[PDB]
């Protein structure tokens, strides 16, 4: 469970002085990442199915394997029904079918914005993905086969704890004045004044009065330029995707604490 | 325990056989690691017991006491049933490991030309045989043929290897892959420039793989259905042969460039083909139903499509070019109905039509029906080749033939080798099952009884029907179960595509009527494209009559019109040897081939021989090279089929490099024989063979046929009875109960005597024959010696006898007698063992060897390292047979020896191999284990 | 169960001097008939489901109804069994649709009604259960109507008469006799024909060669018999011989029927 090494990406996330990088571009790269992740996992699981032909397992794995024999055709390997005396293969074949659903759901969300493929049919978190894998690891060790467990299964576990379900985490970046432009648009629209003209201390005092307060701020009626709509729209895309897909929000040309607290407010007021 | 198994192996072998010989270090490496895994999983006392077993057995080989095996038997007796299964399991795994090490050593052995002595004897061992380029060079440089003649010969050559079921163990792909990982770790661990960390990790990987192979217990999976048997049989094609064929065919291209031919062997050359008997052979096997045959044909088509889909996907990735033909461009944009990658869009279409082809087969298998249209799939090899050849032509047209001659050329070679069904299916049925059908027809019509008619009355009638234009088979014909099985099979043949099948083979063929009978039945059951009909001459009498039989078939106008200048004949070795001993069977076969060939030449027909089980040609590990070169002149001419026995399929095809050498020697030997035949036999050689044959037959039948007490001896001194009653071997062991050896079948005959290390069927009759020739004239000893050194036929026939004697042990065969044979028949036993030692002594004299396999130390070393494990299982088998057979024979029960676990359903575990067991729990599984391991160790004998 | 009135039709069956009526036309018209029939039954069954709303029922009906639960409301047993019959009727119809479109259907025959008796079993079960519960008056309403419809129309609405000319048969048999060297059936007298035809019909040995040279007309005759052999018996009525003259015309068709595998 030690993520000694991790990988992140700027592609599709860095929009600093790059209007080619739109909210939907960010949505798209996140879904593509989940698809290829699923594909790499399906292959690893399949070759692990080939290796784990043992019949001895612990009680917990056996009752689970028995359950899944109570319901495999559109694959090349292991198209025939899987016998119950191969318990690790029964569990891992279920893992493969949930990964197939995982991938198809993302492909549908990418093509159409919606998918009738349930989130329940899929893996929605890495904890849900880890449970079948760790069940096999401890069963293998329970029956004295830790040496086998510490083979490819250990490799697969380290891959899940390194790459997760998105391969890489996406860094978002945008320059600080684009945030000031947004906040000035709503201070003026509400008649509060002009956030741009306020000093750094007046900006802080106001941001933290809103941050400590309990009342929303961003009007849905707000007159937006295309640049303002792009910043707002980006935050909305962050709000509708799973948290595991993202890394940090990086502010280009940062100069003062105001630049940080402004994005914290905009993050909340766009519903993240 | 602490100490290594290294020492006990060193005392078995007289040193290194080449100076890169690391086999003993390999064996010790793997089994030392196994024993440690055994100790950590089941405790030191169990591991110590298994190692003691191995040591006693290794020491017996060092010098054959027999006293020591009896006390080994004493300790194995009285192990609890669970401990017996675990011991037997472990020794089998150790034997498997030893065989894996041997494969690795043969695969990476540095070639040493200094071992060659020139002449044909060099082609009897892999260490000295000649690769494809050396044989090409010999043909042009010594035989004097043109490179153009050699190129043309290759273009017209076809070697057809025919896969058959293993008698005791199926191989799943999973285990073949576990085998390869063990081999790869062993190879990498012995790299010169190895870091300590890489070595530590490769060590941990090797231990990991060995334990995974030990905790799957493929050994104890209970024998599968005929469909599963066929699926596991295809595993070697998946794992080695599929990629092997393109690799070798590329080496053929290399070789012809190296003799001046500057073009590749055209990709439409069927240089090598593969066929199957699994699901097709039903001779004396009613479990092989018409539905099973349909099932294996559809399964084959699925597996082919899957292998093609992955090759095509790897090919799409590679062929990212954008330059292309006009014709390819028009087709690429048609299918757009990414566009800058035209080869990718063509190949993506092929992949989808392949998915359709596979799904259609899956539905037909599950449901008998599929709405997936034949339009949507590939129905012919022509329709599959069209897009691939379009891509080949396009890439050449734009000047990148170099690219096309990469994996695209490989794929084309694979299509012309494997087709859409991977292998073609041979159908086989015995001749009297056809006579039964026709007799039911003739009496139902009131024509008479075809059974009672003379051979020529049969011929006259069948030719009257075949030349006639009126059908015969009534739709209301009263059928028995057997008759319905024969008719139903023909109906399945009629319903399936022609390229799914090879020949229809007639077991126990005796007369031309047997062939014409099935020609009639094929037509009368609606086979619109009939299969070629192939007789199997098994008995000596039928081999004598074979050239006359085929001449009368060739004399008939109708038959010449049907066979269109091509005829195939199958010959049996173990079949014929069971009739009248091996030596006479071998000589009668040589002559039958000789005479059939000129009969064939006279009528202008291309005769193809199909060599069945037991042949010297079947020794695919190396000796097949000489065995093919030794065939009678003008008997091959570019076309031959050979049975690949299950017991050697792992030795020939388990390992990438060994697969390469197996394919290579079959094609080289066959090519050379057609342009460089062996010496023609001298008259005194023939004369001596003729006289030896009568003496050998009379000696063989005097013991096997004319001796009343023989069968009772046979079923006491061998596990033949238990082989049948138990869950191994798939088939009924004999045709009718209680007609002596006559009705017993070849496989049980050889299997039962090989298990006891006696091998009676292979050598009996040869001692009498040799002795008779020496005694008849003092000069005959020198002429037999000259025959062994000068006549390839004679050398390969006794080379086989020598190898089987290397695999034999009179002391162990006597231990079976001591324990299981009634007192009144023990003298008969020791007389057979007298014949054994007298035969071996004179065989060595004629070969000029001082001890067994002198002149093949490589083979000698490989065999002797197996015996410690085989002998352990031999002692186990003998004592398990005595307790099976004698209900209140026991010795002291021992307290349990292995350790682990209160989890396990202990009782259900002793009985995995046959849960419906009728023997006391543990004995059937222990006996099957010994049988599996002894078979694995002995591989091919007779 | 009284077939007091029945309906048949010649459309797609009568081919006398009408070559556009091919074997495929005959296969199509019987498959179309089975689709129309299923649709009319689905509508009748659905209106009957609306009608049969009561909860009282037989022991035999009740355990059948709860058997089908292990597969809307449960407390309406007649609706549960009639819903099952509607389901199979949909399967019957789609299977015929597929056989019409592609020649073959992955929709299994067990998934459908293959007989009139299999279709009647659930309906007669309700009839007996209604009467057993003292509700014969209700059974003698819409349900009785539907039973009379099943016993009148079957699963094909109408049965199909086949008709073809005397001498088109004589042409086939003369082609057979000439090809085997028997002679010319065309030139034989009526008596010679009868004695030969009964020779063959009493005999146990087939006659029609698979390699027999056929003209287009002879092929049409053979092909029609093969279509008849491939379809369910209850789709057809009689085989009618136009311009019939003598007993040989009849016996010739009886021979050809058997020799083409009907």
mmCIF file of C-alpha atoms in Angstrom, chain B residues 397-685:
data_model
loop_
_atom_site.group_PDB
_atom_site.id
_atom_site.type_symbol
_atom_site.label_atom_id
_atom_site.label_comp_id
_atom_site.label_asym_id
_atom_site.label_seq_id
_atom_site.Cartn_x
_atom_site.Cartn_y
_atom_site.Cartn_z
ATOM 1 C CA UNK B 397 4.078 -2.182 -55.581
ATOM 2 C CA UNK B 398 5.165 0.868 -53.570
ATOM 3 C CA UNK B 399 8.672 -0.516 -53.059
ATOM 4 C CA UNK B 400 8.432 -1.871 -49.502
ATOM 5 C CA UNK B 401 8.500 -5.607 -50.173
ATOM 6 C CA UNK B 402 11.063 -5.670 -47.355
ATOM 7 C CA UNK B 403 8.253 -4.749 -44.953
ATOM 8 C CA UNK B 404 5.843 -7.230 -46.545
ATOM 9 C CA UNK B 405 8.433 -9.976 -45.991
ATOM 10 C CA UNK B 406 8.185 -9.379 -42.234
ATOM 11 C CA UNK B 407 5.175 -10.478 -40.196
ATOM 12 C CA UNK B 408 2.720 -10.204 -43.102
ATOM 13 C CA UNK B 409 4.700 -12.961 -44.818
ATOM 14 C CA UNK B 410 4.608 -14.918 -41.548
ATOM 15 C CA UNK B 411 0.826 -14.581 -41.412
ATOM 16 C CA UNK B 412 0.467 -15.761 -45.015
ATOM 17 C CA UNK B 413 2.644 -18.783 -44.251
ATOM 18 C CA UNK B 414 0.436 -19.493 -41.220
ATOM 19 C CA UNK B 415 -2.740 -19.400 -43.323
ATOM 20 C CA UNK B 416 -1.280 -21.821 -45.886
ATOM 21 C CA UNK B 417 -0.106 -24.113 -43.057
ATOM 22 C CA UNK B 418 -3.041 -24.124 -40.606
ATOM 23 C CA UNK B 419 -6.012 -22.902 -42.654
ATOM 24 C CA UNK B 420 -9.212 -22.065 -40.794
ATOM 25 C CA UNK B 421 -9.304 -25.240 -38.657
ATOM 26 C CA UNK B 422 -5.690 -25.412 -37.352
ATOM 27 C CA UNK B 423 -5.618 -29.169 -38.037
ATOM 28 C CA UNK B 424 -7.530 -31.542 -40.283
ATOM 29 C CA UNK B 425 -9.367 -34.414 -38.625
ATOM 30 C CA UNK B 426 -8.676 -38.032 -39.538
ATOM 31 C CA UNK B 427 -11.645 -40.409 -39.274
ATOM 32 C CA UNK B 428 -11.001 -44.049 -38.384
ATOM 33 C CA UNK B 429 -13.279 -47.069 -37.965
ATOM 34 C CA UNK B 430 -12.738 -50.830 -38.193
ATOM 35 C CA UNK B 431 -13.636 -52.820 -41.304
ATOM 36 C CA UNK B 432 -16.176 -55.236 -39.814
ATOM 37 C CA UNK B 433 -18.348 -52.371 -38.549
ATOM 38 C CA UNK B 434 -18.823 -51.501 -42.227
ATOM 39 C CA UNK B 435 -19.537 -55.118 -43.156
ATOM 40 C CA UNK B 436 -22.215 -55.138 -40.460
ATOM 41 C CA UNK B 437 -23.911 -52.138 -42.093
ATOM 42 C CA UNK B 438 -23.913 -53.572 -45.609
ATOM 43 C CA UNK B 439 -25.104 -56.968 -44.374
ATOM 44 C CA UNK B 440 -28.042 -55.218 -42.726
ATOM 45 C CA UNK B 441 -28.732 -53.554 -46.078
ATOM 46 C CA UNK B 442 -28.508 -56.714 -48.197
ATOM 47 C CA UNK B 443 -30.758 -58.838 -45.992
ATOM 48 C CA UNK B 444 -33.320 -56.044 -45.504
ATOM 49 C CA UNK B 445 -33.627 -55.825 -49.291
ATOM 50 C CA UNK B 446 -33.748 -59.617 -49.592
ATOM 51 C CA UNK B 447 -30.625 -59.618 -51.771
ATOM 52 C CA UNK B 448 -28.752 -61.988 -49.443
ATOM 53 C CA UNK B 449 -26.058 -61.802 -46.768
ATOM 54 C CA UNK B 450 -22.997 -59.757 -47.763
ATOM 55 C CA UNK B 451 -21.261 -61.262 -44.715
ATOM 56 C CA UNK B 452 -21.315 -64.758 -46.208
ATOM 57 C CA UNK B 453 -20.199 -63.783 -49.726
ATOM 58 C CA UNK B 454 -16.704 -64.451 -51.057
ATOM 59 C CA UNK B 455 -14.271 -61.573 -51.429
ATOM 60 C CA UNK B 456 -14.867 -61.507 -55.170
ATOM 61 C CA UNK B 457 -18.645 -61.875 -54.852
ATOM 62 C CA UNK B 458 -18.385 -58.807 -52.609
ATOM 63 C CA UNK B 459 -16.285 -56.903 -55.154
ATOM 64 C CA UNK B 460 -18.582 -57.844 -58.035
ATOM 65 C CA UNK B 461 -21.656 -56.625 -56.159
ATOM 66 C CA UNK B 462 -20.147 -53.410 -54.785
ATOM 67 C CA UNK B 463 -18.831 -52.453 -58.241
ATOM 68 C CA UNK B 464 -22.288 -53.173 -59.645
ATOM 69 C CA UNK B 465 -23.768 -50.712 -57.141
ATOM 70 C CA UNK B 466 -21.032 -48.096 -57.578
ATOM 71 C CA UNK B 467 -21.248 -48.069 -61.377
ATOM 72 C CA UNK B 468 -25.036 -48.093 -61.102
ATOM 73 C CA UNK B 469 -26.951 -44.852 -60.691
ATOM 74 C CA UNK B 470 -29.653 -46.039 -58.253
ATOM 75 C CA UNK B 471 -29.505 -45.452 -54.471
ATOM 76 C CA UNK B 472 -29.520 -48.322 -51.993
ATOM 77 C CA UNK B 473 -29.763 -47.345 -48.304
ATOM 78 C CA UNK B 474 -33.402 -47.588 -47.112
ATOM 79 C CA UNK B 475 -34.621 -44.753 -44.868
ATOM 80 C CA UNK B 476 -36.586 -47.281 -42.767
ATOM 81 C CA UNK B 477 -33.575 -49.591 -42.289
ATOM 82 C CA UNK B 478 -33.619 -51.339 -38.879
ATOM 83 C CA UNK B 479 -30.386 -50.247 -37.196
ATOM 84 C CA UNK B 480 -28.609 -51.451 -34.072
ATOM 85 C CA UNK B 481 -26.666 -49.035 -31.878
ATOM 86 C CA UNK B 482 -23.390 -49.795 -33.641
ATOM 87 C CA UNK B 483 -24.892 -49.537 -37.125
ATOM 88 C CA UNK B 484 -26.536 -46.231 -36.196
ATOM 89 C CA UNK B 485 -23.152 -44.964 -34.983
ATOM 90 C CA UNK B 486 -21.526 -45.706 -38.348
ATOM 91 C CA UNK B 487 -24.368 -44.156 -40.353
ATOM 92 C CA UNK B 488 -24.592 -41.170 -38.007
ATOM 93 C CA UNK B 489 -20.879 -40.503 -38.415
ATOM 94 C CA UNK B 490 -21.198 -40.408 -42.204
ATOM 95 C CA UNK B 491 -24.114 -37.997 -41.858
ATOM 96 C CA UNK B 492 -21.938 -35.690 -39.746
ATOM 97 C CA UNK B 493 -19.217 -35.858 -42.410
ATOM 98 C CA UNK B 494 -21.792 -34.855 -45.033
ATOM 99 C CA UNK B 495 -22.941 -31.821 -42.996
ATOM 100 C CA UNK B 496 -19.525 -30.225 -42.367
ATOM 101 C CA UNK B 497 -17.133 -28.315 -44.680
ATOM 102 C CA UNK B 498 -14.743 -30.533 -46.674
ATOM 103 C CA UNK B 499 -11.561 -28.807 -45.459
ATOM 104 C CA UNK B 500 -12.307 -30.010 -41.886
ATOM 105 C CA UNK B 501 -11.337 -33.594 -42.700
ATOM 106 C CA UNK B 502 -8.414 -35.609 -43.913
ATOM 107 C CA UNK B 503 -8.872 -39.281 -44.746
ATOM 108 C CA UNK B 504 -11.288 -42.008 -43.706
ATOM 109 C CA UNK B 505 -9.100 -44.811 -42.317
ATOM 110 C CA UNK B 506 -10.136 -48.481 -42.210
ATOM 111 C CA UNK B 507 -8.793 -50.436 -39.243
ATOM 112 C CA UNK B 508 -8.121 -54.141 -39.779
ATOM 113 C CA UNK B 509 -8.226 -53.766 -43.560
ATOM 114 C CA UNK B 510 -7.678 -57.038 -45.413
ATOM 115 C CA UNK B 511 -9.065 -56.909 -48.962
ATOM 116 C CA UNK B 512 -10.128 -54.365 -51.623
ATOM 117 C CA UNK B 513 -13.747 -54.913 -50.544
ATOM 118 C CA UNK B 514 -13.040 -53.092 -47.274
ATOM 119 C CA UNK B 515 -12.171 -49.913 -49.199
ATOM 120 C CA UNK B 516 -14.955 -50.080 -51.797
ATOM 121 C CA UNK B 517 -17.464 -50.778 -49.019
ATOM 122 C CA UNK B 518 -16.943 -47.352 -47.431
ATOM 123 C CA UNK B 519 -16.841 -45.587 -50.793
ATOM 124 C CA UNK B 520 -20.360 -46.938 -51.280
ATOM 125 C CA UNK B 521 -21.415 -46.000 -47.741
ATOM 126 C CA UNK B 522 -19.996 -42.488 -48.143
ATOM 127 C CA UNK B 523 -22.094 -41.907 -51.269
ATOM 128 C CA UNK B 524 -25.181 -43.643 -49.903
ATOM 129 C CA UNK B 525 -25.204 -41.407 -46.790
ATOM 130 C CA UNK B 526 -24.887 -38.195 -48.774
ATOM 131 C CA UNK B 527 -21.232 -37.127 -48.561
ATOM 132 C CA UNK B 528 -21.128 -34.964 -51.688
ATOM 133 C CA UNK B 529 -17.325 -34.469 -51.491
ATOM 134 C CA UNK B 530 -16.083 -37.886 -50.332
ATOM 135 C CA UNK B 531 -13.036 -38.316 -48.112
ATOM 136 C CA UNK B 532 -10.087 -40.312 -49.472
ATOM 137 C CA UNK B 533 -10.257 -43.906 -48.239
ATOM 138 C CA UNK B 534 -7.149 -45.293 -46.540
ATOM 139 C CA UNK B 535 -6.564 -48.943 -45.549
ATOM 140 C CA UNK B 536 -4.689 -49.856 -42.380
ATOM 141 C CA UNK B 537 -2.875 -53.168 -42.862
ATOM 142 C CA UNK B 538 -2.102 -54.417 -39.332
ATOM 143 C CA UNK B 539 -1.624 -58.188 -39.440
ATOM 144 C CA UNK B 540 1.281 -59.931 -41.162
ATOM 145 C CA UNK B 541 -1.113 -61.764 -43.498
ATOM 146 C CA UNK B 542 -2.623 -58.431 -44.545
ATOM 147 C CA UNK B 543 0.827 -56.896 -45.146
ATOM 148 C CA UNK B 544 1.707 -59.869 -47.356
ATOM 149 C CA UNK B 545 -1.500 -59.371 -49.334
ATOM 150 C CA UNK B 546 -1.323 -55.558 -49.366
ATOM 151 C CA UNK B 547 0.412 -55.109 -52.777
ATOM 152 C CA UNK B 548 -2.111 -57.444 -54.407
ATOM 153 C CA UNK B 549 -4.999 -55.610 -52.717
ATOM 154 C CA UNK B 550 -3.962 -52.209 -54.042
ATOM 155 C CA UNK B 551 -3.178 -53.555 -57.531
ATOM 156 C CA UNK B 552 -6.708 -54.896 -57.874
ATOM 157 C CA UNK B 553 -8.059 -51.553 -56.622
ATOM 158 C CA UNK B 554 -5.943 -49.795 -59.275
ATOM 159 C CA UNK B 555 -7.288 -52.197 -61.920
ATOM 160 C CA UNK B 556 -10.874 -50.923 -61.485
ATOM 161 C CA UNK B 557 -11.967 -48.089 -63.768
ATOM 162 C CA UNK B 558 -14.387 -46.553 -61.264
ATOM 163 C CA UNK B 559 -11.791 -46.370 -58.489
ATOM 164 C CA UNK B 560 -9.118 -44.814 -60.715
ATOM 165 C CA UNK B 561 -11.658 -42.154 -61.681
ATOM 166 C CA UNK B 562 -12.388 -41.412 -58.015
ATOM 167 C CA UNK B 563 -8.835 -41.223 -56.610
ATOM 168 C CA UNK B 564 -7.459 -39.107 -59.493
ATOM 169 C CA UNK B 565 -3.953 -40.515 -59.338
ATOM 170 C CA UNK B 566 -3.377 -40.368 -55.563
ATOM 171 C CA UNK B 567 -3.672 -43.090 -52.907
ATOM 172 C CA UNK B 568 -2.780 -43.201 -49.203
ATOM 173 C CA UNK B 569 -1.962 -46.338 -47.208
ATOM 174 C CA UNK B 570 -1.422 -46.607 -43.457
ATOM 175 C CA UNK B 571 0.966 -49.096 -41.861
ATOM 176 C CA UNK B 572 1.118 -50.147 -38.217
ATOM 177 C CA UNK B 573 4.238 -51.050 -36.250
ATOM 178 C CA UNK B 574 2.963 -51.932 -32.775
ATOM 179 C CA UNK B 575 -0.095 -53.412 -34.508
ATOM 180 C CA UNK B 576 1.954 -55.751 -36.688
ATOM 181 C CA UNK B 577 4.475 -56.482 -33.936
ATOM 182 C CA UNK B 578 1.700 -57.703 -31.656
ATOM 183 C CA UNK B 579 0.789 -60.198 -34.371
ATOM 184 C CA UNK B 580 4.136 -61.932 -34.936
ATOM 185 C CA UNK B 581 6.855 -60.060 -33.053
ATOM 186 C CA UNK B 582 8.685 -56.880 -33.947
ATOM 187 C CA UNK B 583 11.525 -58.210 -36.124
ATOM 188 C CA UNK B 584 9.271 -60.065 -38.568
ATOM 189 C CA UNK B 585 6.808 -57.162 -38.591
ATOM 190 C CA UNK B 586 9.633 -54.777 -39.525
ATOM 191 C CA UNK B 587 10.885 -56.921 -42.406
ATOM 192 C CA UNK B 588 7.426 -57.658 -43.806
ATOM 193 C CA UNK B 589 6.715 -53.931 -43.759
ATOM 194 C CA UNK B 590 9.887 -52.984 -45.651
ATOM 195 C CA UNK B 591 8.970 -55.444 -48.399
ATOM 196 C CA UNK B 592 5.287 -54.434 -48.471
ATOM 197 C CA UNK B 593 6.375 -50.812 -48.966
ATOM 198 C CA UNK B 594 8.806 -51.905 -51.692
ATOM 199 C CA UNK B 595 6.164 -53.857 -53.613
ATOM 200 C CA UNK B 596 3.314 -51.369 -53.143
ATOM 201 C CA UNK B 597 5.580 -48.676 -54.583
ATOM 202 C CA UNK B 598 6.219 -50.329 -57.948
ATOM 203 C CA UNK B 599 2.573 -51.388 -58.173
ATOM 204 C CA UNK B 600 1.857 -47.691 -57.697
ATOM 205 C CA UNK B 601 4.469 -46.632 -60.260
ATOM 206 C CA UNK B 602 3.056 -49.104 -62.796
ATOM 207 C CA UNK B 603 -0.445 -47.585 -62.625
ATOM 208 C CA UNK B 604 0.848 -43.998 -62.365
ATOM 209 C CA UNK B 605 -0.475 -43.208 -58.870
ATOM 210 C CA UNK B 606 1.222 -41.114 -56.186
ATOM 211 C CA UNK B 607 1.418 -43.407 -53.149
ATOM 212 C CA UNK B 608 1.563 -41.826 -49.676
ATOM 213 C CA UNK B 609 2.333 -43.860 -46.564
ATOM 214 C CA UNK B 610 1.019 -42.930 -43.121
ATOM 215 C CA UNK B 611 3.247 -44.324 -40.368
ATOM 216 C CA UNK B 612 1.265 -45.309 -37.276
ATOM 217 C CA UNK B 613 2.269 -45.686 -33.639
ATOM 218 C CA UNK B 614 5.439 -47.577 -32.777
ATOM 219 C CA UNK B 615 7.497 -46.676 -35.830
ATOM 220 C CA UNK B 616 11.159 -45.810 -35.752
ATOM 221 C CA UNK B 617 10.011 -42.764 -37.735
ATOM 222 C CA UNK B 618 8.021 -41.795 -34.634
ATOM 223 C CA UNK B 619 11.163 -41.010 -32.610
ATOM 224 C CA UNK B 620 10.863 -37.300 -33.366
ATOM 225 C CA UNK B 621 13.623 -36.329 -30.945
ATOM 226 C CA UNK B 622 16.408 -37.111 -33.399
ATOM 227 C CA UNK B 623 16.475 -40.721 -34.601
ATOM 228 C CA UNK B 624 13.567 -39.970 -36.950
ATOM 229 C CA UNK B 625 16.154 -38.319 -39.217
ATOM 230 C CA UNK B 626 17.927 -41.603 -39.958
ATOM 231 C CA UNK B 627 14.675 -43.573 -39.829
ATOM 232 C CA UNK B 628 13.234 -41.561 -42.709
ATOM 233 C CA UNK B 629 16.463 -41.818 -44.710
ATOM 234 C CA UNK B 630 16.295 -45.618 -44.217
ATOM 235 C CA UNK B 631 12.919 -46.079 -45.912
ATOM 236 C CA UNK B 632 12.841 -48.141 -49.115
ATOM 237 C CA UNK B 633 13.855 -46.193 -52.235
ATOM 238 C CA UNK B 634 11.095 -44.291 -54.050
ATOM 239 C CA UNK B 635 8.651 -44.695 -51.161
ATOM 240 C CA UNK B 636 8.193 -41.042 -50.198
ATOM 241 C CA UNK B 637 8.711 -38.676 -53.155
ATOM 242 C CA UNK B 638 7.813 -35.523 -51.257
ATOM 243 C CA UNK B 639 4.712 -36.802 -49.404
ATOM 244 C CA UNK B 640 4.588 -38.561 -46.019
ATOM 245 C CA UNK B 641 2.518 -38.625 -42.811
ATOM 246 C CA UNK B 642 3.817 -39.576 -39.353
ATOM 247 C CA UNK B 643 2.045 -40.161 -36.036
ATOM 248 C CA UNK B 644 3.237 -37.918 -33.204
ATOM 249 C CA UNK B 645 2.630 -39.948 -30.071
ATOM 250 C CA UNK B 646 1.478 -38.156 -26.946
ATOM 251 C CA UNK B 647 4.330 -39.655 -24.910
ATOM 252 C CA UNK B 648 6.852 -37.670 -26.997
ATOM 253 C CA UNK B 649 4.877 -34.533 -27.904
ATOM 254 C CA UNK B 650 6.413 -32.689 -24.943
ATOM 255 C CA UNK B 651 9.967 -33.747 -25.846
ATOM 256 C CA UNK B 652 9.561 -32.591 -29.457
ATOM 257 C CA UNK B 653 7.391 -29.502 -29.104
ATOM 258 C CA UNK B 654 7.420 -28.328 -25.486
ATOM 259 C CA UNK B 655 10.333 -25.934 -26.001
ATOM 260 C CA UNK B 656 10.741 -23.262 -28.697
ATOM 261 C CA UNK B 657 14.137 -24.483 -29.937
ATOM 262 C CA UNK B 658 13.227 -28.172 -29.777
ATOM 263 C CA UNK B 659 10.104 -27.405 -31.818
ATOM 264 C CA UNK B 660 12.389 -25.790 -34.402
ATOM 265 C CA UNK B 661 14.679 -28.833 -34.602
ATOM 266 C CA UNK B 662 11.736 -31.251 -34.768
ATOM 267 C CA UNK B 663 10.208 -29.458 -37.756
ATOM 268 C CA UNK B 664 13.631 -29.112 -39.358
ATOM 269 C CA UNK B 665 14.696 -32.764 -39.295
ATOM 270 C CA UNK B 666 11.365 -34.013 -40.668
ATOM 271 C CA UNK B 667 11.662 -31.694 -43.683
ATOM 272 C CA UNK B 668 15.391 -32.249 -44.268
ATOM 273 C CA UNK B 669 15.333 -36.056 -44.043
ATOM 274 C CA UNK B 670 12.246 -36.277 -46.257
ATOM 275 C CA UNK B 671 13.777 -33.940 -48.845
ATOM 276 C CA UNK B 672 17.080 -35.824 -48.960
ATOM 277 C CA UNK B 673 15.625 -39.339 -49.278
ATOM 278 C CA UNK B 674 13.817 -38.459 -52.505
ATOM 279 C CA UNK B 675 17.098 -37.436 -54.152
ATOM 280 C CA UNK B 676 19.527 -39.694 -52.226
ATOM 281 C CA UNK B 677 18.015 -43.114 -51.411
ATOM 282 C CA UNK B 678 19.669 -45.667 -49.114
ATOM 283 C CA UNK B 679 21.666 -48.646 -50.317
ATOM 284 C CA UNK B 680 19.585 -51.348 -51.944
ATOM 285 C CA UNK B 681 19.661 -54.591 -49.919
ATOM 286 C CA UNK B 682 22.082 -57.313 -50.940
ATOM 287 C CA UNK B 683 20.703 -60.783 -51.761
ATOM 288 C CA UNK B 684 22.322 -62.458 -48.743
ATOM 289 C CA UNK B 685 20.822 -59.721 -46.561
#
